[PDB]
Amino acid sequence: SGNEHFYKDWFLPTARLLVRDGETAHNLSVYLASYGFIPHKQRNSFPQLKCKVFGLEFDHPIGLAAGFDKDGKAFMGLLNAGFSHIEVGTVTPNPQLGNARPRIFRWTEKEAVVNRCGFNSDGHDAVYERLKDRPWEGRGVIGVNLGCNKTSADPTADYVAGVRKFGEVADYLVINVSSPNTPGLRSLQTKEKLRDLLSKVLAARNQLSKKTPILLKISPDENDQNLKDIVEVALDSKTRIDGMIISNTTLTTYEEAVACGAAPIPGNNKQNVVYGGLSGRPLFEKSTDCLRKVSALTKGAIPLIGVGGISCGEDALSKLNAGASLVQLYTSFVYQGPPVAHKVAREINKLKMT
Ligand SMILES: Cc1cc2nc3c(=O)[nH]c(=O)nc-3n(C[C@H](O)[C@H](O)[C@H](O)COP(=O)(O)O)c2cc1C
Numbered sequence: 001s002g003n004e005h006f007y008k009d010w011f012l013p014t015a016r017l018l019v020r021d022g023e024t025a026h027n028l029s030v031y032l033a034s035y036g037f038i039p040h041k042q043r044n045s046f047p048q049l050k051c052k053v054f055g056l057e058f059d060h061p062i063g064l065a066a067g068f069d070k071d072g073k074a075f076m077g078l079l080n081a082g083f084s085h086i087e088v089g090t091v092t093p094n095p096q097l098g099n100a101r102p103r104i105f106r107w108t109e110k111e112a113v114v115n116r117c118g119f120n121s122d123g124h125d126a127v128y129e130r131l132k133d134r135p136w137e138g139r140g141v142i143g144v145n146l147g148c149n150k151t152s153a154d155p156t157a158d159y160v161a162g163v164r165k166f167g168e169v170a171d172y173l174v175i176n177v178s179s180p181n182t183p184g185l186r187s188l189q190t191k192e193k194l195r196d197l198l199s200k201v202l203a204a205r206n207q208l209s210k211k212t213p214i215l216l217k218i219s220p221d222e223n224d225q226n227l228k229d230i231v232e233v234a235l236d237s238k239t240r241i242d243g244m245i246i247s248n249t250t251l252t253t254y255e256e257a258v259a260c261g262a263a264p265i266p267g268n269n270k271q272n273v274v275y276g277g278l279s280g281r282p283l284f285e286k287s288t289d290c291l292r293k294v295s296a297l298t299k300g301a302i303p304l305i306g307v308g309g310i311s312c313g314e315d316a317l318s319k320l321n322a323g324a325s326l327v328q329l330y331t332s333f334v335y336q337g338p339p340v341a342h343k344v345a346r347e348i349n350k351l352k353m354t
């Protein structure tokens with residue numbers, strides 16, 4: 001390991017002992033990365049791993065998934081940290097508070113995290129002011145993950161507003177398919193509402209000066225039939241997107257939630273409650289299988305981004321061999337620190353030389 005074991009074994013465990021709350025440590029690390037207090041890494045360090053996706057040059061297929069830099073405050077330091085691309089988001093049109101706190105819980109025994117943030121964003125305008133000048137030009141790729149407000153009348157209008165707001169400055173845009181977890185934003189959980197959403201979104205996209213790539217991020221909990229329906233609408237000529245992201249988080253069970261403090265919810269006695277989404281190593285097996293399914297349904301027509309449970313190099317290689325062109329992580333960055341960006345890259349380069 002070397003300088004990598006210093007975080008996974010010495011720095012981060014002591015930090016978790018000091019900052020017991022997960023979201024507090026999240027705010028602190030974002031505060032540090034916004035000012036540059038973060039180990040930098042040299043680009044062009046992996047010549048055999050450079051790739052071209054959506055016509056964009058990537059230093060390596062490894063990037064930071066959405067939800068970490070929700071407001072675009074520290075994407076520059078994270079690009080310098082080792083990630084080849086940062087997915088700013090999820091950003092809502094109006095500034096949103098999100099669900100009640102605590103909403104983030106560590107499951108260190110399995111290197112996992114259970115969260116129920118609920119799209120806490122600073123709004124379109126605040127995040128757009130941090131991305132307008134494109135300061136990352138030539139230093140990496142930046143995508144924007146668009147969302148809708150909780151009190152929104154027409155959620156598809158919120159996604160269209162996001163496409164029009166960030167379509168000129170972002171390298172790519174992402175829209176989250178509503179997970180079959182709760183009625184919260186599940187008004188678009190049918191095949192025709194998705195086709196309607198993609199139709200309006202692509203119309204707004206075509207109104208831009210450049211045909212900015214539109215990606216669709218799905219949940220690993222979709223059954224076989226709904227998974228096929230999502231792929232069909234995503235590939236139809238009238239509503240053809242540019243790529244997909246597989247996947248998001250999995251609905252946590254009661255036993256998995258009580259092991260990390262996600263359950264019970266203070267002030268909630270009902271059993272039909274969503275404790276949160278499970279990310280980390282327990283997600284890798286399911287999210288990869290879902291990716292392997294989608295890659296077969298699309299026949300490899302559109303690029304895919306494998307996300308979920310990547311903790312070492314062979315995990316990312318499994319996703320890349322399954323049909324993914326890019327890979328993203330989040331939870332392993334919590335448990336392994338900044339070196340996790342180049343660590344996985346090193347291991348991939350060692351596995352290809354055989
Ligand atoms: C605390 C937290 C917040 C997240 N916020 C978002 C988000 O706002 N938008 C989104 O598309 N995914 C969000 N995610 C999901 C991640 O982007 C990613 O899909 C998932 O965590 C991948 O699993 P992994 O971290 O184990 O690799 C969030 C995940 C966590 C743990």
Ligand SMILES: O=C1C(O)=C(Nc2ccc(F)cc2)C(=O)c2ccccc21
Nearest residue numbers: 022023025026029104113333334337338
């Ligand atoms: O975002 C989180 C975070 O920044 C943590 N610490 C951390 C991570 C990397 C780093 F380089 C320095 C400190 C957390 O413990 C955490 C826990 C649960 C959810 C999110 C985070």
